[PDB]
Enzyme design. Structure first.
Site, PDB file in Angstrom:
ATOM      1  N   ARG A 187      40.418  98.676  62.841  1.00  0.00           N
ATOM      2  CA  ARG A 187      39.836  99.109  61.550  1.00  0.00           C
ATOM      3  C   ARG A 187      38.891 100.294  61.737  1.00  0.00           C
ATOM      4  NH1 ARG A 187      38.254  93.545  60.357  1.00  0.00           N
ATOM      5  NH2 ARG A 187      39.200  94.177  58.355  1.00  0.00           N
ATOM      6  N   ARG A 242      28.163  86.093  51.982  1.00  0.00           N
ATOM      7  CA  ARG A 242      29.353  86.894  51.619  1.00  0.00           C
ATOM      8  C   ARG A 242      29.496  86.861  50.098  1.00  0.00           C
ATOM      9  NH1 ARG A 242      33.894  85.229  56.159  1.00  0.00           N
ATOM     10  NH2 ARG A 242      35.217  86.739  55.045  1.00  0.00           N
ATOM     11  N   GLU A 299      36.174  91.305  48.835  1.00  0.00           N
ATOM     12  CA  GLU A 299      36.552  91.782  50.174  1.00  0.00           C
ATOM     13  C   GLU A 299      37.973  92.299  50.122  1.00  0.00           C
ATOM     14  OE1 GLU A 299      35.906  88.496  52.841  1.00  0.00           O
ATOM     15  OE2 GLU A 299      33.660  88.428  52.462  1.00  0.00           O
ATOM     16  N   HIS A 322      41.416  92.505  51.957  1.00  0.00           N
ATOM     17  CA  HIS A 322      42.149  91.675  52.945  1.00  0.00           C
ATOM     18  C   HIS A 322      43.486  92.339  53.192  1.00  0.00           C
ATOM     19  CE1 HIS A 322      44.559  88.166  54.274  1.00  0.00           C
ATOM     20  NE2 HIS A 322      45.231  88.176  53.130  1.00  0.00           N
ATOM     21  N   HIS A 323      43.970  92.226  54.421  1.00  0.00           N
ATOM     22  CA  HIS A 323      45.281  92.716  54.782  1.00  0.00           C
ATOM     23  C   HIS A 323      46.274  91.543  54.786  1.00  0.00           C
ATOM     24  CE1 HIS A 323      42.534  95.928  55.915  1.00  0.00           C
ATOM     25  NE2 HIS A 323      43.564  96.748  55.881  1.00  0.00           N
ATOM     26  N   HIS A 346      39.429  84.601  50.857  1.00  0.00           N
ATOM     27  CA  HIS A 346      39.781  85.304  52.107  1.00  0.00           C
ATOM     28  C   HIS A 346      39.708  84.303  53.274  1.00  0.00           C
ATOM     29  CE1 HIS A 346      39.395  89.174  54.806  1.00  0.00           C
ATOM     30  NE2 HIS A 346      40.595  88.612  54.856  1.00  0.00           N
ATOM     31  N   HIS A 386      42.992  82.527  55.538  1.00  0.00           N
ATOM     32  CA  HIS A 386      43.066  82.541  57.005  1.00  0.00           C
ATOM     33  C   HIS A 386      43.046  81.143  57.702  1.00  0.00           C
ATOM     34  CE1 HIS A 386      43.706  86.743  57.497  1.00  0.00           C
ATOM     35  NE2 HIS A 386      42.652  87.019  56.737  1.00  0.00           N
TER      36      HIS A 386
END
Ligand SMILES: [Ca+2]
Ligand SMILES: [Zn+2]
Lengths: 92, 132
Positions: free
Chosen positions: B3, B94, B98, B100-101, B125, B129
Site C-alpha cells: 500500500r 476506528r 474504511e 477495503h480491497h 471490514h 476478514h
C-alpha cells in the site's frame, strides 16, 4: 477545564465542539481524539452521532449540538456547564 | 507495504444511487461509484493514503454523493478526510469509513484497482476478514 463537562463553561464547551466541526486536525487521529473526548464528556448515548448524524429537527451546527447536549443533561439530572462570567455587571 | 508504493488508478466503479453507504455495513461493502472512478482513472498516486485522500476529495465534488452526508461529514470530505461512520458501526479506535480491497492486497488484489476497492464500516471490514 478538564475532568468533567461541568468543568467547562458553555462558551468553552462550544469552542471545543467548534474545533471538532472544523475538521482541521493535522491528521484524522488528532480530530478522532477530540471526538472520543466529546463522547466521554457528554455521556450522551448517541455519542459521535450528535456531531455527524444529527436529528433533522434541530440545527446542524456546533450551537445545535451544544443545545441538544445541554437539554439532554438537564432532562436526565446530570450536572450542567460551569457558570460563566456572562452575568457580571460592569460599572459606568 | 504494497500500500506504500505508488500506482495508477484503473478500472470501473459501479452505478450508485441515493443510499450509497447503506451498503457499507453488509457483504463486501459499497462500490466506488462509476462517475468517481471516471474522474480518478489513470491518475498517478504516491501511495494508497494519497489515493484515499484524493478519493474523499472527489466524493466531496459530486453533489449527489455530497448530499448524502450531513454538515460535519461534508467538511471532512472537502478536507480529504474520511467521513465518520454511524456510532453503531464503529469499533473502538476506528470511527471512520474504511477503504477495503475485496480481493485483498495480500492475495495480489490491485491496490488502486477501483473495481476492487470497497467502502466499508469498521465493524464490517473486521467481520469480512474473520469470515462473517
Ligand atoms: Ca481507509
Ligand atoms: Zn480489507
Amino acid at each position: 477545564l478538564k475532568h468533567s463537562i461541568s468543568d467547562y463553561t458553555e462558551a468553552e464547551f462550544l469552542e471545543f465542539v467548534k474545533k471538532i466541526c472544523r475538521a482541521e486536525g493535522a491528521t484524522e487521529e488528532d480530530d478522532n481524539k477530540l471526538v472520543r473526548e466529546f463522547e466521554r464528556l457528554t455521556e450522551h448515548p448517541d455519542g459521535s452521532d450528535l456531531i455527524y448524524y444529527p436529528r433533522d429537527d434541530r440545527e446542524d451546527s456546533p450551537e445545535g449540538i451544544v443545545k441538544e447536549i445541554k437539554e439532554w443533561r438537564a432532562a436526565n439530572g446530570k450536572s450542567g456547564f460551569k457558570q460563566g462570567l456572562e452575568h457580571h455587571h460592569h460599572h459606568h | 507495504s504494497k500500500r506504500n508504493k505508488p500506482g495508477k488508478a484503473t478500472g470501473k466503479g459501479k452505478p450508485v444511487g441515493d443510499k450509497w453507504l447503506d451498503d457499507a455495513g453488509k457483504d463486501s461493502g459499497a462500490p466506488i461509484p462509476d462517475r468517481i472512478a471516471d474522474k480518478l482513472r489513470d491518475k498517478e498516486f504516491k501511495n494508497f493514503d494519497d489515493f484515499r485522500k484524493k478519493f474523499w476529495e472527489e466524493v466531496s465534488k459530486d453533489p449527489d454523493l455530497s448530499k448524502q452526508f450531513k454538515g460535519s461529514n461534508k467538511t471532512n470530505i472537502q478536507k480529504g478526510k474520511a467521513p465518520f461512520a454511524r456510532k453503531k458501526d464503529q469499533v473502538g479506535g476506528r470511527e471512520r469509513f474504511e477503504l477495503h480491497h475485496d480481493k485483498p492486497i495480500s492475495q495480489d488484489g490491485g491496490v488502486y484497482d477501483m473495481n476492487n476497492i470497497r467502502v466499508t464500516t469498521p465493524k464490517r471490514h473486521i467481520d469480512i476478514h474473520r469470515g462473517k
